Every structure is written in structure tokens, then in C-alpha cells.
Amino acid sequence: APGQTGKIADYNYKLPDDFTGCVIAWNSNNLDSKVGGNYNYRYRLFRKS
Amino acid sequence: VVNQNAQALNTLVKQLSSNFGAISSVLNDILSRLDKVEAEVQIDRLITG
């Protein structure tokens, strides 16, 4: 969401403070959860800024 | 005339220490304590006043 912060907003994907658009999401547990953990998906944990 | 000119400028300077409903009259107190989305609400109060 525009103006938000946290390790996704800060280091992975930032919406501009006056975003025009729509955000759409759905639980994908059947497609994307795997029995031992799905390591195909990762996120940036650290940045310089 | 001299006294009216001086009082009008003294009043104009002393309005800089008014909040007009912002959290502070000082822009650094806003910009150092609120995020880029929330600071603008308090800056817009100071601008308007």
C-alpha cells in the first residue's frame, strides 16, 4: 500500500506515495506451499538503503 | 506609521511559532518524527496557517 514501510515495502517492492491503481491478492497455499517448505520463493532481507 | 509597520512585521514573524493544529510549529519536528506520508498532513496545516 502507498506510504507503508517494513522489509517488503523497504527492500523488495515500493508503491509511490500517490499510487493510482488497485492491489489484488489471494491465498495460494495449494499452488505454492510444499510438504517440506517451498524454497522457490525468497525475499530480500537486507539493503544499504 | 513607524509603530504600525513595526507591529505588523513583529506579528508576522511571531505567527511562525503557531501550530495551527499541527504537532509542532517547527518543520524539522515534523520531518524528523513522522514518515513521508504522515508528515505532509502536519506540513499542510503549517502551510495553510
From Swiss-Prot, chain A:
Region Immunodominant HLA epitope recognized by the CD8+: start-end pairs: 38-46
Impact when changing V35P: In strain: Omicron/XBB.1.5, Omicron/EG.5.1
Q: What is the effect of changing K7N?
A: In strain: Beta/B.1.351, Omicron/BA.1, Omicron/BA.2, Omicron/BA.2.12.1, Omicron/BA.2.75, Omicron/BA.4, Omicron/BA.5, Omicron/BQ.1.1, Omicron/XBB.1.5, Omicron/EG.5.1; May enhance affinity to human ACE2 receptor
Variant or mutagenesis effect after changing K34T: In strain: Omicron/BQ.1.1
- Complex and partners: Binds to host ACE2. RBD also interacts with the N-linked glycan on 'Asn-90' of ACE2. Cleavage of S generates a polybasic C-terminal sequence on S1 that binds to host Neuropilin-1 (NRP1) and Neuropilin-2 (NRP2) receptors. Interacts with host integrin alpha-5/beta-1 (ITGA5:ITGB1) and with ACE2 in complex with integrin alpha-5/beta-1 (ITGA5:ITGB1). May interact via cytoplasmic c-terminus with M protein. May interact (via N-terminus) with host bilirubin and biliverdin, thereby preventing antibody binding to the SARS-CoV-2 spike NTD via an allosteric mechanism.
Q: What is the annotated role of this protein in its UniProt record?
A: Attaches the virion to the cell membrane by interacting with host receptor, initiating the infection. The major receptor is host ACE2. When S2/S2' has been cleaved, binding to the receptor triggers direct fusion at the cell membrane. When S2/S2' has not been cleaved, binding to the receptor results in internalization of the virus by endocytosis using host TFRC and GRM2 and leading to fusion of the virion membrane with the host endosomal membrane. Alternatively, may use NRP1/NRP2 and integrin as entry receptors.
Q: What is this protein called?
A: Spike protein S1
Please tell me the species this chain comes from.
Severe acute respiratory syndrome coronavirus 2 (2019-nCoV)
Task: State the organism's lineage.
Answer: Viruses, Riboviria, Orthornavirae, Pisuviricota, Pisoniviricetes
Q: Which residues of the full protein are shown?
A: 411 to 459 of 1273
Curated annotation (Swiss-Prot), chain B:
Q: Which superkingdom is the protein from? A: Viruses
- Coiled-coil regions listed: 1-43
Function of the molecule: Subunit of the fusion protein that is processed upon entry into the host cell. Mediates fusion of the virion and cellular membranes by functioning as a class I viral fusion protein. Contains a viral fusion peptide that is unmasked after S2 cleavage. This cleavage can occur at the cell membrane by host TMPRSS2 or during endocytosis by host CSTL. In either case, this triggers an extensive and irreversible conformational change that leads to fusion of the viral envelope with the cellular cytoplasmic membrane, releasing viral genomic RNA into the host cell cytoplasm.
Give the protein name, as stated in the record: Spike protein S2'
* Originating organism: Severe acute respiratory syndrome coronavirus 2
